[PDB]
Amino acid sequence: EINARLEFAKTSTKEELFQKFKTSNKGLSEEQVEISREQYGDNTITRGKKSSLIKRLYQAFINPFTIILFVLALVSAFTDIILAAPGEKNPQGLIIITTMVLISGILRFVQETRSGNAAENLLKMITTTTNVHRLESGSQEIPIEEVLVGDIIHLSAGDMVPADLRIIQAKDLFISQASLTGESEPVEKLDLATAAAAASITESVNLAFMGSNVISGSAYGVVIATGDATIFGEMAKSVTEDSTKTTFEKGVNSVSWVLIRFMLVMVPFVLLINGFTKGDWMEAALFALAVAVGLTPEMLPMIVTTCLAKGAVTMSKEKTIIKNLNSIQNLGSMNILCTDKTGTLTQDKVVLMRHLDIHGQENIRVLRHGFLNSYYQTGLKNLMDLAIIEGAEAKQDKNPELGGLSSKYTKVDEIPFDFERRRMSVVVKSNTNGATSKTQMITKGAAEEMLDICTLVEDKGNVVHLTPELRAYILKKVDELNEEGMRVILVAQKTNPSPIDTFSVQDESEMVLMGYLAFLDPPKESTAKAIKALNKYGVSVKILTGDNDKVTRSVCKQVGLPVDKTILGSDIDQLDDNELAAVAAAASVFAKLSPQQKARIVTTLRNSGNSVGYMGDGINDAAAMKSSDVGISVDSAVDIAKESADVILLEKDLMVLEKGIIEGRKTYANMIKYIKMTASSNFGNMFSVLIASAFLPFIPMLSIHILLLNLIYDFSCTAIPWDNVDEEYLVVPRKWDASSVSKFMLWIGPTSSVFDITTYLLMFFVICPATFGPFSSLVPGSVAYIGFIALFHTGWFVESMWTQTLVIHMIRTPKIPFLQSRASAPLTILTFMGIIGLTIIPFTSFGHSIGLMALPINFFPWLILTVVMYMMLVTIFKKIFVSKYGEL
Ligand SMILES: [Mg+2]
Ligand SMILES: [Mg+2]
Ligand SMILES: [Mg+2]
């Protein structure tokens, strides 16, 4: 099996492995890559699910809305083709409905393909890359999914291990396997072929597994397993509906079910009325089909897809790259934001440096040792190390002690940073003295941890013993430096260290202390304004720092966040979850936090129902990012932070996040606005047809006219995603609602029903009789009868289109429709083009081909009066609805 091959990989020599895998020291070849792809596998994760194109399409094609449209198609085909009288066939409606069914199915399939959960990277806007060596292309960076068995991969600091790897060349490689086995302790990896039966292969020496993070050093590895064959692939499990979020799919399904409920209430009523009143069941079937067609917002999926695409493109242009379509929903409902202070609030650059001795006087030797440690560090370089390097380089012009430090020294061993010890050690050997060069250990870390391993102190050019009094004095000086906001670091040296074969954590003892290193980290000028803007939109900002509480308090004092309440890690460790929820909800500053503590805080905040998003860019932040509803990182972050994040920003600041949140809320606002408007507009007309069915001697409007009306209305409403949105709607996060649509329909549609009845009366009694003659004296079947019916249909058609388009401005905004809130240019112009085009429709021969007749001039003043009198009623009912419920 897979396991048997892993043992061979971890036990074979490098040349036998090369011969078996057909891999040379310079990479793979094209033909062998193809053979491996068609024999071993592809580095794609199925997560326990697999579906072909046919199965996926069939599954996507059976959404409720497509079933509605298919039922409409079946009814139309039965009524117009099979059960219709010979000589009269109207396949236009059937053809257009079938085409619309196909379009809706394709759009639903696209949405399903591009929608995922748990920060799934389905859009592929940004993809992580790994360094892969090949025979012809040399060293190139390729996406993780393109890695095959046998490829030689170079691992650096921060790069996530992309598959199961057997290391063939390791240079002090330390791997953080916390993302796999939960152990936050880095493990040293060697290239030796260990012939020992390690426990369960997971904690072995010369194997690097998928999903593990590289902390320090550079290593060359050979891929042995990809895809589901790795340990990470087996651990990859799909948790269906892990979050209680109501995605756009669920909202669309709820809207479709509301439409089905209304159809079941109404269509049989019309059928019964006509069948038991007029006695011709064919006319009843025609009326039922007409009502069913009218109730359907036929091009709803097209508008939904347009809204989603506009949201995605707009957020991408706003330096906010998303991972899937559910990311917009995740980000819009943000309620509490948690992040570390470094990089986000404070600019990532030191503006003031103090390399001080024990007593706080400026010293050069401490800076020299710190520069050696920083420059010869092989791991990730933070702001402090970069500031150390820049200061040392700047001071090299006048100081001969600092000259040539980057060329006469060589690293031989190193122990990377870890949150359980908070120190970094690098062993440095001189390159200009040969074997007798003598080796110097250099250790750098936080003052409290660095004071527990030092027994000597370099003071006044001489070394003295470390008494508790000196330790207390050093801690007092460190606290005093932390008072102003400077970050304090201690530096120590040791000579000689233990040999590299036995150099471990136990060797850090009896070091002599040089002094402190103070760095000033000032906050950005725009931090306060961004924080206030975020707090305006209901997003509370909490800080989860691992640094000293004094520095975080100093930063929060300038930024503006509360500083009276500060919580440390020990208190959270000693207090239970039930009190933790309250104490975290009532606080804003957290300091001295371990990564597991940050994950616990995020989980506790999420337990109270708050949608909490975590912002991070480091390896140790992966647990918090995975435990939060939304994950935010930067494009320059480590691969693990980017992979586990739901949203990736190109800039590390809060204004971009605020703009992304605004756009995410705007997308849903526009979608629900269009849905409610179209639903109410359809319901009013269909209720009118229901009421006036028993009183009218003919059909108020044909099915084809209704379908054309809906098509033109939706092509005019495709500009919804480009209209202005009220700030009061975007201030608070919003969740999907279904009964609100039903209430809106029931409370708005009957307002238009009265005026549609009025238009029925006017056309049947005033205009059409004046043009053609009284209906009671008109012999059925003649040309004049056909003209009467066509004129009535055209009149109600034009009136309905004008009403539906012009109620958009009144319904959309709960304020005054023109004096206080204004509609955007694109929606207005597109609506006007739709109105004008459809009004030209009856006059052309195409209108006469489907049963429309040219309107008389006298009709238009009545249309204007009807529009105005409808607008006043819509305003009154909008006021009543706002007073009753409070939102639209
Ligand atoms: Mg990389
Ligand atoms: Mg070692
Ligand atoms: Mg209407």
Side-chain angles (χ1 to χ4, degrees), residues 307-327:
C307 289
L308 290 166
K310 197 274 188 165
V313 170
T314 302
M315 301 175 58
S316 188
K317 276 201 225 180
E318 289 283 355
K319 298 184 181 175
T320 298
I321 293 176
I322 59 171
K323 283 214 170 183
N324 55 58
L325 272 73
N326 289 325
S327 100

Side-chain angles (χ1 to χ4, degrees), residues 716-755:
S716 292
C717 261
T718 189
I720 296 308
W722 284 290
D723 72 336
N724 304 324
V725 182
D726 288 307
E727 195 88 352
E728 298 89 348
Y729 209 76
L730 302 168
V731 159
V732 300
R734 301 266 171 202
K735 308 289 204 293
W736 267 94
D737 203 325
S739 188
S740 185
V741 184
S742 189
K743 298 174 197 177
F744 191 93
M745 302 193 358
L746 293 173
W747 268 103
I748 298 287
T751 73
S752 74
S753 300
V754 171
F755 283 60

Side-chain angles (χ1 to χ4, degrees), residues 113-157:
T113 297
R114 253 58 189 285
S115 204
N117 62 358
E120 203 74 86
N121 186 11
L122 292 181
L123 284 168
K124 292 179 185 0
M125 280 199 161
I126 181 175
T127 324
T128 79
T129 49
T130 58
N131 187 8
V132 170
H133 289 257
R134 301 210 172 200
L135 271 163
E136 295 73 18
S137 311
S139 38
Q140 78 200 124
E141 293 204 20
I142 57 168
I144 283 184
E145 283 81 357
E146 297 186 4
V147 175
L148 301 178
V149 191
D151 282 310
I152 280 193
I153 307 208
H154 187 194
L155 301 171
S156 79

Side-chain angles (χ1 to χ4, degrees), residues 755 758-764 766-768 770-771 791-803 838-839 842-843 853-867:
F755 283 60
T758 278
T759 297
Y760 285 164
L761 204 55
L762 159 86
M763 205 77 55
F764 181 57
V766 177
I767 293 172
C768 184
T771 281
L791 197 66
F792 186 95
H793 288 181
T794 300
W796 194 54
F797 181 46
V798 171
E799 190 274 327
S800 186
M801 182 76 248
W802 272 59
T803 303
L838 168 141
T839 304
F843 303 120
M853 184 145 298
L855 289 167
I857 300 177
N858 304 6
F859 164 63
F860 287 116
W862 298 101
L863 181 45
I864 291 312
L865 169 132
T866 300
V867 165

Side-chain angles (χ1 to χ4, degrees), residues 280-386:
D280 196 352
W281 287 105
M282 190 43 60
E283 207 159 79
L286 298 158
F287 273 56
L289 173 59
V291 168
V293 164
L295 267 195
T296 289
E298 262 99 7
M299 307 223 69
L300 183 70
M302 171 175 108
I303 309 300
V304 173
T305 305
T306 301
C307 289
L308 290 166
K310 197 274 188 165
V313 170
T314 302
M315 301 175 58
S316 188
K317 276 201 225 180
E318 289 283 355
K319 298 184 181 175
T320 298
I321 293 176
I322 59 171
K323 283 214 170 183
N324 55 58
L325 272 73
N326 289 325
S327 100
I328 302 173
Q329 203 275 321
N330 284 322
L331 200 67
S333 73
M334 191 146 278
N335 211 35
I336 294 177
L337 169 69
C338 299
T339 173
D340 196 356
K341 81 183 184 186
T342 299
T344 297
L345 309 176
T346 66
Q347 69 213 18
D348 223 5
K349 167 65 162 133
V350 177
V351 314
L352 183 62
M353 201 205 198
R354 290 188 181 165
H355 44 83
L356 301 175
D357 67 348
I358 281 289
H359 294 292
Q361 312 175 28
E362 223 194 305
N363 203 349
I364 302 300
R365 192 171 178 186
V366 49
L367 194 63
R368 186 185 84 137
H369 293 139
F371 165 73
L372 282 175
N373 190 232
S374 169
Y375 182 74
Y376 288 111
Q377 143 184 123
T378 35
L380 271 183
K381 311 213 175 203
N382 51 59
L383 71 91
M384 305 199 281
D385 291 300
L386 287 169

Side-chain angles (χ1 to χ4, degrees), residues 172 174 188 190 413-414 500-501 503:
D172 319 321
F174 289 90
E188 151 81 41
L190 292 162
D413 207 348
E414 147 175 356
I500 67 176
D501 322 84
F503 180 70

